[PDB]
Structure 1
Amino acid sequence: AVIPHGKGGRSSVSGVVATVFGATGFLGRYVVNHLGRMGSQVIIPYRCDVYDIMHLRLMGDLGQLTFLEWDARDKDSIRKAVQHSNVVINLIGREWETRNFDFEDVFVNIPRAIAQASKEAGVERFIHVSHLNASMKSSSKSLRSKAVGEKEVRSVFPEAIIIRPSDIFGREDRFLNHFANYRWFLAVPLVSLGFKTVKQPVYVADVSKGIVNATKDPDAVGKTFAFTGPNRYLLFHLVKYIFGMTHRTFIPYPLPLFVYSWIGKLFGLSPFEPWTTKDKVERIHISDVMPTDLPGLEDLGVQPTPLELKSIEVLRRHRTYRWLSSEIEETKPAKTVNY
């Protein structure tokens, strides 16, 4: 049944079963929507509470999506999820380090275990998602850790696809938003005033379409990829683009990363969810990456979508009424960088 037997759409089948582990958060809800609209079964392992997995139940058709509970501490949950799949996708990743899990676990130990069972179960593809510009000694606890794992993944389950996306924008993101949120607290306290650091941002759908195409693309095997996105923007300009599109006053008062590092520490202390933290602060200001030679969305078949276009949808909320109705051509025009 890897023979797709139907007109494309729900109720067809493209015959690729898949275990998409991080399908409770931000990126996986789009992956299930594409894998799903592609009518492929998706065994979605959820450790969450069912009330929060419902939003996934309609992104599929009768029987397409199957759910089962998995906790990273114990295997056999990883084993049974990947037992009947042929595709496996890893989207596990947390910004903060909850008392129970370290960047160690969510980025190395776990993906390793999943991939372990993946190879053990015979799944052909272990699409894994590590961050762009994320290598060892990248001076950020997570990014460094993330790359360490990329190796563990490769070692155990070779011939694996590894996507390393740039910052991911799109609704419900924590990229544009973190910057947008600054409105609430004072003004944007951008380090380097936001200059001197450039970020390539890619829409969630562009990454999601890429992961789906990769699961079904033969040449993709053993191929790393970088989903950079269409334009490289300096941080100060992008925060200014978030503002104006947010329609709230902008003030890029500077300060050193070390202060903001000490600062976020406290925000991280927040028990529920850090509003920001040292690791995040770092990956924003210092983190900057120039892709050089990796296939990318175009290669995998996606036309990266510029941020100039789909920014209404993710910032139209952050406007006060009386500005909500503001259209796009009105939005403060942005500009791209090379650096």
Structure 2
Amino acid sequence: DIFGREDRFLNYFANIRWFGGVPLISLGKKTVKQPVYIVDVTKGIINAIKDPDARGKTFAFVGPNRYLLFDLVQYVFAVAHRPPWTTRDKVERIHTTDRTLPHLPGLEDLGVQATPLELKAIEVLRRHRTYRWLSSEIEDVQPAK
């Protein structure tokens, strides 16, 4: 799940808080997820494009540390506080759960640094009343990590 400024994922979670309060966590837990920030991805593509021996080799990207549970939802909802789509296509989409298979060149095998969620999450989120930096109490799920 790719994460950034205008993206469709975490922004969606920020906007799903509205009436009825039933985005997900119907059965709870069961969801492990590791969003990755965008510039890391696009730098992945540009190194892949200008670096030889990136051809004919399939691989994936990984959120370096976070690897969060649904505690994400209440986190990104906690920080930034509080103010046509689709069906189980979409909610089952976002409810899909896996990090899948370890052995595939992850990131550094393409030679680029990884970004933890926090700071960029602040950047994209903004909102709230903006007047107090405070702390925001990082989620730090890292279940079983």
TM-score range, shorter-chain basis? 0.7 to 0.9
Q: 1:246–1:315: 8 Å Cα contact kept in structure 2? A: yes
Change (3 A) 1:306 1:188: farther
Residue 111 of structure 2, aligned match among 277, 301, 304 = 301
Alpha-carbon shift at residue 184 of structure 1 (Å): 2.5
Deviations 1:154-182 (A, max 9, x none): xxxxxxxxxxxxx0111111111111111
Task: Give TM-score, length-normalised by structure 2.
Answer: 0.86
The runs of 5 or more residues in structure 2 that have no matched partner are: none
Q: Distance in 1 between matches of 2:114 and 2:27?
A: 28
1:310 aligns with 2:145: no
1:212 aligns with 2:22: no
Q: Distance in 2 between matches of 1:193 and 1:315?
A: 27
Q: SS of 2:107's equivalent? A: helix
Q: 2:30–2:97: 8 Å Cα contact kept in structure 1? A: no
User: Residue 69 of structure 2 corresponds to which residue in structure 1?
Assistant: 234
Change (3 A) 1:188 1:242: farther
Alpha-carbon shift at residue 194 of structure 1 (Å): 4.3
Residue 18 of structure 2, aligned match among 184, 192, 208 = 184
Query: Could you tell me which amino acid in structure 2 is paired with residue 332 of structure 1?
Result: E
State the identity %: 64
RMSD over aligned Cα atoms: 2.0
Quick check: which one's helix share is greater?
A: 1
Deviations 1:46-84 (A, max 9, x none): xxxxxxxxxxxxxxxxxxxxxxxxxxxxxxxxxxxxxxx
Larger radius of gyration: 1
Change (3 A) 1:188 1:241: farther
Alpha-carbon shift at residue 233 of structure 1 (Å): 0.4
Q: 2:17–2:23: 8 Å Cα contact kept in structure 1? A: no
Quick check: which one's strand share is greater?
A: 1
User: Residue 196 of structure 1 corresponds to which residue in structure 2?
Assistant: 30
Query: Could you tell me which amino acid in structure 2 is paired with residue 331 of structure 1?
Result: S
Task: Give TM-score, length-normalised by structure 1.
Answer: 0.39
Deviations 1:285-330 (A, max 9, x none): 133223411112222122211112211111113x2x3xx2332x61
Larger RCO, structures 1/2 (Cα 8 Å, 6+ apart): 2
Query: Could you tell me which amino acid in structure 1 is paired with residue 131 of structure 2?
Result: S
User: Residue 287 of structure 1 corresponds to which residue in structure 2?
Assistant: 97
Q: Distance in 1 between matches of 2:90 and 2:113?
A: 28
Q: Distance in 2 between matches of 1:188 and 1:311?
A: 23
Change (3 A) 1:246 1:238: same
Alpha-carbon shift at residue 188 of structure 1 (Å): 4.6
Query: Could you tell me which amino acid in structure 1 is paired with residue 50 of structure 2?
Result: K
The runs of 5 or more residues in structure 1 that have no matched partner are: 1-166, 250-273
Change (3 A) 1:180 1:311: same
1:330 aligns with 2:135: yes
Q: Distance in 2 between matches of 1:297 and 1:277?
A: 33
Change (3 A) 1:203 1:291: farther
Q: SS of 1:227's equivalent? A: coil
Alpha-carbon shift at residue 196 of structure 1 (Å): 1.2
Residue 221 of structure 1, aligned match among 51, 55, 59 = 55
Q: Distance in 2 between matches of 1:292 and 1:220?
A: 19
Q: 1:194–1:285: 8 Å Cα contact kept in structure 2? A: no
Q: Distance in 2 between matches of 1:298 and 1:185?
A: 43
Q: Distance in 1 between matches of 2:22 and 2:107?
A: 32
Q: SS of 2:72's equivalent? A: helix
Q: 1:308–1:334: 8 Å Cα contact kept in structure 2? A: no
Moved over 6 A (4+): none
